[PDB]
Design a protein around this ligand. Structure first.
Ligand SMILES: CCCCCCCCCCCCCCCCCC(=O)OC[C@H](COP(=O)([O-])OCC(O)COP(=O)([O-])OC[C@@H](COC(=O)CCCCCCCCCCCCCCCCC)OC(=O)CCCCCCCCCCCCCCCCC)OC(=O)CCCCCCCCCCCCCCCCC
Ligand SMILES: CCCCCCCCCCCCCCCCCC(=O)OC[C@H](COP(=O)([O-])OCC(O)COP(=O)([O-])OC[C@@H](COC(=O)CCCCCCCCCCCCCCCCC)OC(=O)CCCCCCCCCCCCCCCCC)OC(=O)CCCCCCCCCCCCCCCCC
Ligand SMILES: CCCCCCCCCCCCCCCCCC(=O)OC[C@H](COP(=O)([O-])OCC(O)COP(=O)([O-])OC[C@@H](COC(=O)CCCCCCCCCCCCCCCCC)OC(=O)CCCCCCCCCCCCCCCCC)OC(=O)CCCCCCCCCCCCCCCCC
Ligand SMILES: CCCCCCCCCCCCCCCCCC(=O)OC[C@H](COP(=O)([O-])OCC(O)COP(=O)([O-])OC[C@@H](COC(=O)CCCCCCCCCCCCCCCCC)OC(=O)CCCCCCCCCCCCCCCCC)OC(=O)CCCCCCCCCCCCCCCCC
Ligand SMILES: CCCCCCCCCCCCCCCCC[C@@H](O)O[C@H](CO[C@H](O)CCCCCCCCCCCCCCC)COP(=O)(O)OCC[N+](C)(C)C
Ligand SMILES: CCCCCCCCCCCCCCCCC[C@@H](O)O[C@H](CO[C@H](O)CCCCCCCCCCCCCCC)COP(=O)(O)OCC[N+](C)(C)C
Ligand SMILES: CCCCCCCC/C=C\CCCCCCCC(=O)OC[C@H](COP(=O)(O)OCCN)OC(=O)CCCCCCC/C=C\CCCCCCCC
Ligand SMILES: CCCCCCCC/C=C\CCCCCCCC(=O)O[C@H](COC(=O)CCCCCCC/C=C/CCCCCCCC)COP(=O)(O)OCCN
Lengths: 105, 83, 98, 347, 121, 129, 99, 171, 140
């Protein structure tokens, strides 16, 4: 099946592209560098089953960074409630959200 | 020796384009390993600052790291200026 | 998961269904394969660019190259079929049967 | 074709399979599959004819669809977890689609339809290479992710494959279609033990490869494609017919021949996981494979079919080309039961 | 068992160094004799296929078959024995490290154990 | 907001895929494929990957679909997943793509060998006999 | 936005000019009264496609020159171009470029 | 899970630098040479804390230092600097190459008045050391405790007890 | 999916005959639709109308078999006053086979279907009682 020639010879044929946080050119960081680093360090040398059971918090944070489903849900809820209130007329946006603010450098 | 020269003379006639192409390709392959300026090109590429140089935290045991940009310590680009 | 990814996967599924429908004209089958490949390219490009996975920017180009090669191969086979039958109808490939 | 070009294409096929087996990146695995498919097509078309062209185009269409499905599964897995390494799939939909892609590549039912026709159209040499070598990359990939595959899908596909191979082998008369259905049934047997023990999968793969290599080399030696052409063989080389009958009995799972080692062992493994109904069903189904193997043996060696006058001239000429490793293949496929525990070598 | 991911495993070693701590199989091992017999059978089949005197066509070829089979059989037996020793070592270490999951059975005597008796009539 | 311009382009992509998926008169299906490819390149360019979009628009449309048409004629919600920081004094996509020669030596080797074998395979298949 | 406006203006102007050119002569009433399939064309099309793929591989060279791995980048670029030349040579010697 | 803490708007109030980009680029070299210490302290703090909310004081310090630098420039060399930044501003790319003459005039004026030496090539890109009293953060990633590793037992190999123990095989 | 199986299994065996019959009819209809789709894909008879006739007859046959099996099994379980007895499932399977034979209109298929469907239903009931596993999870 998997004949690990690379680890036997220390060649690094294709291991540099496997993860986001592995020696990017000009040290350009990935969007989720910190979360991936945390999860990788949590799950190293632990085994698949134990990594799945024990490092679930880090993987959940990593997936949240990748897809941001919960952030989208929260923003959508806030926007919908604001729209409902502005339809009923009990809420008025501040000048900052109307373009009348004073911008800063 | 004689056969190779005769073959080259034959090819230089009735087929100059292929001879020129092969000569240029061989020169382009061979020459860079001999030119002394390739290390200069590598050094010039290395000396271009693309990212912000993050300062190190002083602990009193870094004599080679300058404390100010004007200080004599650190790499110098006088060789590039002379080029 | 935003609507753009959903639309891209929907396009891939539609192209796969078109490939598997097989009305006639094997050229249409090749076109469906290449539509699936284009959808794959778009989806991979969006995913890689969104997460700033810099070293993965190589992946689409490579993909495209290989896939295009396959397309070329497929076209060659199609040509031979026509050269044996005069036309590229799918129903003509019925000599071999289970 | 030119011998150098043929050797280069064979090296490229082997290099693609090696790249699939030795790589830890999904993109590199897909590249290996593409290289294998690209170089495998001219091998089918070495002897140019309409049947070979049609078989090659069917094979190309199926493999290209499988590769596209595999790439889509890789993309979804990357989307839901930014990982390229071949490990736990981290997604159910991606795992399902990758399982279908690897089933298409392998030939498991209901994606089995292309195997009999592709085997029938293409030559014996091409068929031999396609039947045994092609299985190594998809099986390695499946073994690498066996901890994530859904047992229901793999088990039902394996059961369907065994049923379909057993039923379809009864009707066929041409030897190549019989071999195609035999391969389908053997892969149904072999992929059923993937969720439990991959070592049994590798052992069954090795035994099946040895048996089918021996049988295809015997069929090439006595240049027979249909059943009657094989029945004519006894009048010239009876030893070939006897060896072929012994190998056919081995391939049916009859003890103490080598072909009994995998099935038995596989059953044992599924009994350790409290799976009792399924091994019984697969055994009673493999009885059908045994039946059509026995019919072939009756036609070939155990009875003497009528011969032809011109066969007299064939008595005076000897087989000019001898294929090495045929006796070794026969011995390994018939008399290696007493060394069963060597499977602990994690072969 | 799946000892593929066992920690500290060299990726492509047929026989690790620790496997030298085990007794090598004897040269008169019955399994080695069986490999020699397989080699002889292969030689006889090779003679039969080529249409040559089966018993006494090529003595060098039969000798080479026997020797190759014995060589591979010896090395395969060494690897098999090493793998089984590894399995037993892991078993015993795990059963020692987890006493809670393998409690000592309260030893009992047949005198104070009631087994139902089913007469045969 | 531009009526979800990314969503508009995605819907037009799906519409073109449906149009050419019915496989009517393969030349017309081809035309639908060019339309869909142009829309996809528009999506990629709008997202920010200028080089990859131009790569599609050059390779795919100009060469590969053109060869497809040649052979045919011969026969008978958004904007929220984005970033916050800057890329510096370069384009990240261009740097990642140009890292193919300094990092991806293995990829270059395997792709070049595959292309050469593809040339050989095409010649062998189209030789005939 | 600017490029979209430019493309729309170009297409609109071209379409308007084409339709007015097509319809200006249409106001005035008037009388108002295969097999071959040459293989060489397909072969040249396929060769162009494959060389286009190799050019696509070669394209990022202008940015590939600033890497500090000048030896490796140079070796890889020359390897790609040598493979392109070898493919052309194989097509040449096996009579793949004949009319 | 948890509540994010954000500084009040009174904590983010500071005298902004209200000059355009061309003006900043005109005096970029002298600004880097003179105002180096607060900038380096702020940037080291930013890279070590990995948190914008822990580096407000250094931001206010760098703003104040830049304002002091520009006030000195306004006091002493207003007119040559005005000409220099006007020329830099005119160009689309804001190239230093266009008007080296105005740059030379500004440099000589500021060397006469304030005795400032323009940094040479390869000096502002040096990596430097910063002497600060801010404690080194012990755990900036806010990581949890790493799970315990596997037992990885050790011992001397012994022959398998009674061989393979596979069905009837005694060896 | 597995929702229909859950609907069938949630009901107690000895009660709610109509609900059991409805669940069995739904399962039979789903199986008939699947087999009709496969037959249509693999053997397009002549046109759209013949195809819809074939799929309708297959679905109706399967639904009738399922409904009869469920109704008979539940009625036998209630009347015998002895639940969890595989005999009720055997009677249900034989009744389903009898309706299959009546639909196909030949006594041989009716008798064979009765035997081989009562046996299968009894085996299913025995497995449900003893917890037999068809797709066993990978314990070891
Ligand atoms: C576990 C692993 C399981 C392995 C799966 C099964 C492997 C079977 C695939 C092997 C290739 C098939 C084959 O050789 O023919 C079938 C062959 C039958 O022989 P045949 O029918 O007489 O050959 C007809 C060919 O079509 C006649 O071919 P030809 O006329 O073109 O002659 C060219 C010939 C001669 O080759 C040359 O001319 C050498 C020149 C080198 C050129 C250098 C270019 C490199 C760049 O080269 C070859 O035949 C192919 C050799 C490829 C090298 C493989 C290493 O059967 C086997 O080879 C059995 C192999 C034994 C099992 C594998 C090893 C044991 C385990
Ligand atoms: C257990 C197995 C053990 C051996 C395994 C295989 C090895 C040999 C097989 C090669 C084939 C050669 C052959 O055909 O025989 C001819 C040959 C005699 O005839 P020939 O004039 O030389 O050449 C005639 C041509 O060969 C050909 O003559 P022909 O063509 O003119 O005659 C035509 C005939 C020719 O066709 C054949 O003869 C067929 C050859 C046998 C098939 C080989 C199968 C491979 C192994 C599988 C065994 C399965 C075992 C599991 C149980 C299931 C049984 C199926 O074909 C037919 O009659 C048509 C219908 C055949 C009837 C049904 C076929 C059933 C075959 C199943 C055989 C299973 C038992 C085999 C036992 C050994 C048989 C040789 O036999 C021999 O001389 C070799 C026999 C063994 C030699 C032993 C000498 C060493 C002993 C002295 C030292 C003492 C040792 C102890 C040392 C310590 C003491 C101090
Ligand atoms: C000769 C020159 C060298 C020499 O003299 O070395 C002496 C050498 C001295 O070794 P040793 O360690 O001092 O003896 C220890 C005890 O013998 C006993 O040592 P052990 O009990 O610890 O080891 C025996 C054990 C482990 O041994 C094995 O795993 C090897 C299995 C068979 C060994 C065959 C050796 C010779 C084969 C001749 C051809 C047979 C046909 O075998 C088993 O666990 C039971 C397996 C029984 C059969 C396997 C199941 C398949 C059933 C159908 C078989 C048909 C095959 C395909 C047709 O002994 C031999 O090599 C002579 C033969 C060995 C027989 C012992 C095995 C007894 C159980 C099976 C008996 C079958 C006999 C077949 C006839 C053999 C005719 C010769
Ligand atoms: C416990 C759950 C419920 C029970 C489940 C188990 C029941 C299985 C039912 C279906 C069994 C299939 C085989 C039976 C006979 C073959 C079909 C046939 O033609 O007979 C027509 C025959 C009438 O004769 P005829 O049509 O006039 O003769 C036509 C010509 O003579 C010549 O006929 P033809 O040439 O037109 O043949 C038709 C055609 C077409 O044949 C077929 O359609 C094959 C059927 C396979 C699908 C079976 C459905 C299983 C659904 C699973 C999901 C269930 C969810 C719930 O055959 C072929 O051309 C070759 C097909 C085979 C080649 C390989 C294709 C295999 C594809 C994959 C298989 C399944 C994939 C599943 C998922 C895979 C994912 C990895 O009798 C019928 O009308 C019977 C129709 C259906 C009755 C089913 C009874 C259902 C009972 C359910 C009771 C539930 C009780 C409540 C719960 C407790
Ligand atoms: C008929 C039965 C099959 C016979 C097959 C042909 C026999 C000849 C083959 C010649 C030797 C094979 C291998 C060559 C030795 C060097 C390669 C060695 O380094 O590989 C090791 C491994 O060695 C091989 O695996 C063992 C080969 C032995 C095969 C024989 C077992 C057959 C059992 C039943 C038949 C008994 C033998 C009959 C006579 C041969 C490395 O293992 P590792 O990389 O860490 O793990 C990879 C597998 N994983 C991924 C699943 C974990
Ligand atoms: C080792 C086994 C040799 C014999 C077996 C060969 C098997 C098939 C041939 C293919 C294997 C060749 C191995 C090449 C692997 C590439 C990686 C290795 O070579 O290191 C590279 C060294 O580069 C070398 O120049 C590779 C040159 C090899 C390519 C030239 C010839 C290749 C031919 C191979 C077959 C292709 C078709 C046939 C052509 C004739 C990396 O350079 P480096 O700078 O440290 O790292 C950069 C990454 N950083 C930024 C993180 C530091
Ligand atoms: C376990 C599942 C149990 C399924 C029970 C039904 C099986 C009964 C088969 C016994 C023999 C049937 C018989 O009597 O043969 C006659 C009858 C008439 O032949 P036709 O040509 O089809 O004519 C149809 C129009 N009259 O034959 C048949 O239709 C049945 C032939 C195939 C039955 C196979 C059923 C297997 C079901 C499980 C498959 C997995
Ligand atoms: C190792 C470097 C390689 C890379 C550099 C070159 C890259 C690109 C150039 C090659 C592209 C492909 C070349 C394909 C070669 C095909 C050869 C061939 O078949 O052509 C022969 C003819 O060509 C020949 O004669 C044989 C080869 C010609 C000469 C080859 C090179 C000679 C030596 C080159 C080096 C010269 C010495 C160096 C001098 C340095 C300066 C002092 C047939 O002629 P036709 O055109 O088909 O007939 C038409 C008329 N009826």
């Amino acid at each position: 099946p998997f004949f690990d020639v690379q680890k036997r010879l220390g060649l690094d044929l294709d291991r540099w592209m496997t993860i986001q946080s592995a020696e990017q050119p000009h040290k350009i960081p990935g969007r989720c560098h910190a979360f991936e680093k945390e999860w990788i360090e949590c799950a190293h040398g632990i085994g698949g089953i134990r990594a799945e059971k024990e490092c679930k918090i880090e993987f959940d944070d990593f997936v949240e960074c990748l897809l941001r489903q919960k952030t989208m849900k929260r923003l959508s809820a806030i926007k919908r409630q604001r729209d409902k209130l502005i339809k009923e007329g009990k809420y008025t946006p501040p000048p900052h959200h109307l373009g009348k603010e004073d911008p800063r450098p | 020796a004689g056969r190779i020269a005769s073959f080259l003379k034959n090819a230089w006639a009735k087929e100059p384009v292929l001879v020129a192409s092969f000569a240029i390709g061989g020169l382009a392959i061979i020459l860079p390993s001999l030119s002394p300026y390739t290390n200069y090109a590598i050094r010039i590429n290395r000396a271009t600052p693309y990212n912000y140089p993050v300062p190190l935290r002083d602990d009193g045991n870094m004599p080679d790291v300058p404390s100010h940009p004007q200080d004599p310590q650190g790499p110098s680009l006088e060789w590039l200026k002379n080029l | 998961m935003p609507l753009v990814y959903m639309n891209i996967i929907m396009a891939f599924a539609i192209a796969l269904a078109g490939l598997l429908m097989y009305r006639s004209h094997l050229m249409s089958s090749l076109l469906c394969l290449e539509g699936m490949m284009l959808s794959l390219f778009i989806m991979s490009t969006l995913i890689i660019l969104n997460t700033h996975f810099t070293l993965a920017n190589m992946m689409p180009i490579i993909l495209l190259v290989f896939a295009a090669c396959e397309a070329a191969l497929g076209l060659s086979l199609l040509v031979m079929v026509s050269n044996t039958y005069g036309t590229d109808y799918v129903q003509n490939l019925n000599l071999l049967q289970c | 074709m030119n011998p150098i070009i043929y050797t280069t294409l064979i090296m490229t096929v082997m290099s693609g399979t090696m790249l699939v087996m030795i790589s830890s990146h999904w993109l590199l695995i897909w590249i290996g599959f593409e290289m294998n498919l690209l170089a495998m097509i001219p091998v089918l078309m070495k002897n140019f004819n309409p049947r070979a062209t049609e078989a090659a185009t069917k094979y190309f269409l199926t493999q290209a669809t499988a590769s596209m499905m595999l790439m889509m599964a890789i993309i979804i897995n990357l989307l839901y977890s930014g990982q390229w390494t071949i490990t736990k799939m981290f997604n159910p939909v991606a795992m399902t689609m990758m399982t279908m892609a690897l089933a298409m590549k392998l030939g498991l039912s209901p994606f089995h339809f292309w195997v009999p026709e592709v085997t029938q159209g293409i030559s014996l040499q091409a068929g031999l290479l396609l039947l045994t070598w092609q299985k190594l990359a998809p099986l390695s990939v499946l073994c690498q992710i066996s901890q994530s595959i859904n047992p229901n899908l793999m088990l039902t596909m394996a059961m369907l494959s065994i049923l379909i191979g057993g039923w379809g082998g009864l009707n066929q008369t041409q030897l190549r279609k019989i071999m195609a259905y035999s391969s389908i049934a053997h892969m149904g047997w072999m992929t059923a033990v993937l969720p439990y023990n991959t070592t049994m999968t590798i052992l069954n793969l090795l035994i099946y490869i040895t048996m089918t290599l021996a049988m295809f080399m015997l069929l090439i030696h006595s240049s027979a494609t249909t059943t009657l052409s094989l029945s004519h063989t006894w009048n010239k080389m009876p030893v070939i017919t006897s060896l072929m009958m012994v190998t056919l009995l081995s391939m049916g799972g009859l003890p103490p021949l080598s072909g009994f080692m995998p099935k038995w062992m596989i059953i044992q493994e599924m009994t350790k996981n409290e799976s009792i109904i399924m091994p019984t069903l697969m055994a009673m189904t493999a009885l059908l494979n045994l039946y059509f193997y026995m019919r072939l043996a009756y036609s070939s060696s155990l009875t003497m079919f009528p011969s032809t006058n011109n066969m007299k001239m064939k008595w005076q000429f000897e087989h000019t080309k001898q294929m090495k490793l045929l006796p070794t293949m026969i011995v390994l496929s018939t008399l290696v039961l007493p060394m069963t525990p060597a499977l602990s070598s994690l072969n | 068992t799946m000892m593929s991911g066992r920690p500290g495993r060299v990726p492509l070693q047929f026989l690790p160094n620790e496997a030298r701590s085990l007794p090598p199989p004897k040269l008169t091992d019955p399994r080695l004799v069986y490999m020699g017999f397989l080699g002889y059978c292969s030689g006889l089949i090779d003679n039969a296929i080529r249409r040559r005197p089966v018993v006494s066509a090529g003595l060098h070829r039969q000798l080479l078959y026997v020797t190759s089979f014995v060589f591979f059989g010896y090395y395969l037996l060494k690897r098999q024995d090493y793998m089984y020793a590894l399995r037993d070592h892991d078993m015993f270490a795990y059963v020692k490290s987890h006493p809670e999951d393998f409690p000592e059975k309260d030893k009992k005597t047949y005198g104070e154990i009631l087994e139902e008796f089913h007469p045969v009539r | 907001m531009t009526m979800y311009i990314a969503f508009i382009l995605s819907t037009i992509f799906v519409i073109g895929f449906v149009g050419f998926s019915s496989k009517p008169s393969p030349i017309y299906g081809g035309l639908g494929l060019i339309v869909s490819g142009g829309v996809g390149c528009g999506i990629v360019l709008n997202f920010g990957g200028s080089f990859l979009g131009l790569m599609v628009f050059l390779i795919y449309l100009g060469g590969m679909l053109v060869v497809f048409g040649y052979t045919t004629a011969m026969a008978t919600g958004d904007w929220v997943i984005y970033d916050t920081g800057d890329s510096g004094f370069f384009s990240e996509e261009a740097m990642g793509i140009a890292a193919l020669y300094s990092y991806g030596t293995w990829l270059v080797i395997v792709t070049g060998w595959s292309l050469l074998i593809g040339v050989v395979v095409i010649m062998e298949i189209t030789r005939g006999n | 936005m600017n490029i979209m406006l430019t493309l729309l203006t170009n297409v609109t102007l071209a379409s308007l000019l084409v339709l007015i050119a097509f319809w200006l002569p249409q106001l005035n009433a008037y009388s108002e009264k295969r097999l071959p399939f040459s293989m060489k064309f397909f072969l040249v099309a396929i060769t162009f496609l494959l060389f286009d793929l190799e050019i696509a591989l070669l394209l990022p060279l202008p940015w590939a020159s600033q890497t500090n791995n000048l030896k490796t980048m140079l070796t890889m670029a020359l390897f790609l171009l040598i493979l392109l030349a070898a493919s052309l040579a194989y097509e040449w010697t096996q009579k793949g470029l004949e009319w | 899970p948890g509540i994010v803490e954000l500084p009040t708007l009174e904590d983010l109030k500071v005298q902004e630098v209200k000059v355009s980009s061309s003006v900043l680029k005109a005096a970029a070299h002298h600004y880097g040479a003179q105002c180096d210490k607060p900038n380096k302290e702020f940037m080291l703090c930013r890279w070590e804390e990995k948190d914008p909310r822990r580096c407000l004081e250094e931001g206010k310090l760098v703003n104040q230092c830049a304002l002091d630098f520009f006030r000195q420039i306004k006091r002493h060399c207003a007119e040559p600097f005005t000409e220099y930044w006007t020329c830099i501003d005119y160009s689309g790319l804001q190239l230093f190459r266009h008007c080296r003459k105005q740059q030379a005039k500004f440099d000589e004026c500021v060397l006469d008045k304030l005795g400032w030496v323009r940094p040479d090539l390869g000096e502002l890109s040096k990596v430097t050391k910063v002497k600060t009293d801010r404690p080194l953060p012990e755990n900036p990633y806010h990581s949890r405790a790493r799970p315990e590793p596997n037992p990885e037992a050790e011992g001397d190999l012994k022959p398998a007890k009674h061989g393979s123990r596979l069905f009837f095989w005694t060896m | 999916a597995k929702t229909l199986l859950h609907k069938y299994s949630d009901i107690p065996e000895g009660t709610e005959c109509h609900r059991k019959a409805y669940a069995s009819t739904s399962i039979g209809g789903a199986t008939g639709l699947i087999v009709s789709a496969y037959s249509i894909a693999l053997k397009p008879p002549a046109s759209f109308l013949e195809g819809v006739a074939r799929t309708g007859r297959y679905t109706f046959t399967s639904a009738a078999i399922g409904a009869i099996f469920g109704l008979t099994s539940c009625i036998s379980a209630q009347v015998r006053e002895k639940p969890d007895d595989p005999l009720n499932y055997f009677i249900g399977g034989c009744a389903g086979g009898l309706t299959l034979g009546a639909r196909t209109r030949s006594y041989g298929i009716g008798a064979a279907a009765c035997a081989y469907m009562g046996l299968t239903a009894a085996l299913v009931k025995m497995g449900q009682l003893e917890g037999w596993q068809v797709f066993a999870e990978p314990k070891v």
